[PDB]
Amino acid sequence: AQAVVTQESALTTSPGETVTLTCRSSTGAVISSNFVSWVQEKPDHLFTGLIGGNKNRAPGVPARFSGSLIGDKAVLTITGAQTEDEAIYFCALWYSNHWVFGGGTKLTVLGQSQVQLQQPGAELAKPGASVQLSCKGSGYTFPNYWMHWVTQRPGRGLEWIGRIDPNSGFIRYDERFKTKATLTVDKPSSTAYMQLSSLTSDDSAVYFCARGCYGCIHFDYWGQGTTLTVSS
């Protein structure tokens, strides 16, 4: 509904400590049909998925990361923090027909890939116009995965736009973007496209593609993000 996902604002740790990050729902409970993912953001908006399906560690994620649902919440535990774990951690919950991200937890640590999703670094467009963003997937079987699209605006949060299944052609849009975005794919070139229409400068943001599928670790791999600038 009007679902809001809330996380710790900040946490401070040091090497060898155990970190507990939590993720709670405004409905009053996180449940297994929320299909929780945990993702990690490092500087230059560099996103890495860690946990998906509430409790499954993504391949190539270090063993010190674990996730599960405990009590009324989703929990990410780092058992033995490392300095490279300094980052922003977001949880993402499925609510009936869209994904909702938490506000992110900033983790400070004292003591300071075959799969590629290829996006242009930047695009420029004028207000009132439309722009086409592209994301080329390589190192995996493109038609066997959904492509999610997500946006992050300056200093603010993550918002899910939609996803497309290349095999069935099924598209699910977030209500928030259903007039703004149009998703397509070209299977032979292994490329997913997003058209953004009726551009204003509030559309100036970073736009990411990320992988998913039915029963997979959603948002396990991410493009670098295209920085879109809308200016005259």
Are both 100 and 135 inside the same structural domain?
Answer: no
| 104, 145, 205 from 40: Cα distances, Å | 9, 21, 19
Q: What are phi and psi of 130, to 5 degrees?
A: -125, 160
Q: Give the domain range for residue 78.
A: 5-109
Instruction: Tell me the C-alpha distance between 121 and 62, whole Å.
Output: 28
| DSSP reduced 3-state for 52 | strand
Pair 54, 25: CB distance under 8 Å:
no
Declared resolution, Å: 1.7
* Dist CA 181 CA 102 (whole Å): 22
**β-bridge mates for residue 154, sequence order:** none
Break the chain down into helix, strand, coil percent, rounded to 5: 5, 50, 40
Contact in structure between 130 and 198 (CB atoms under 8 Å): yes
Method: X-ray
User: Distance (Å, rounded) from C-alpha 75 to C-alpha 69?
Assistant: 6
Q: Please state whether 162 falls in left (phi above 0), alpha (psi between -120 and 50) or beta.
A: left
- Same domain as 33, residue 102: yes
Measured CA to CA, the distance from residue 29 to residue 137 in angstroms comes to 35
For the stretch 164-175, what's the b/e string if a residue is b when 16 or more beta carbons lie within 10 angstroms of its beta carbon? bbbeeeebbbbe
Q: Are residues 214 and 122 in the same domain?
A: yes
Which residue from 95, 76, 98, 91 is spatially nearest to 27, judged by alpha carbons?
95
- Rounded to whole angstroms, the Cα distance separating 17 from 14 reads 6
* SS3 state at 3: coil
Give the span between the Cα atoms of 90 and 6, in whole angstroms. Answer: 10
Our count of domains for the chain comes to 2
| Final residue belonging to a domain, choices 93, 109, 125 | 109
Give yes or no: residues 125 and 82 share one domain.
no
Same domain, 84 and 147: no
Tokens 């998703």 belong to: 183
Sheet strand arrangement including 205-212: 122-125, 226-230, 205-212, 146-152, 158-164, 171-173
Distance CA(190)–CA(210), nearest Å, equals 14
User: Which whole-number Å values give the CA distances from 232 to 124, 126, 128, 227, in the listed order?
Assistant: 10, 5, 9, 16
The reply to whether 136 and 182 lie within a common domain is yes
Tally Cβ neighbours within 10 Å of residue 24: 20
Per-residue tokens: 103: 């506000």
Q: What is the CATH number of the domain that holds 211?
A: 2.60.40.10
- Amino acid identity of residue 220, one-letter, is D
Q: Give CA–CA dist 154/65, Å, rounded.
A: 28
Sheet with 5-7, side-by-side order of all strands: 5-7, 18-25, 73-79, 65-70
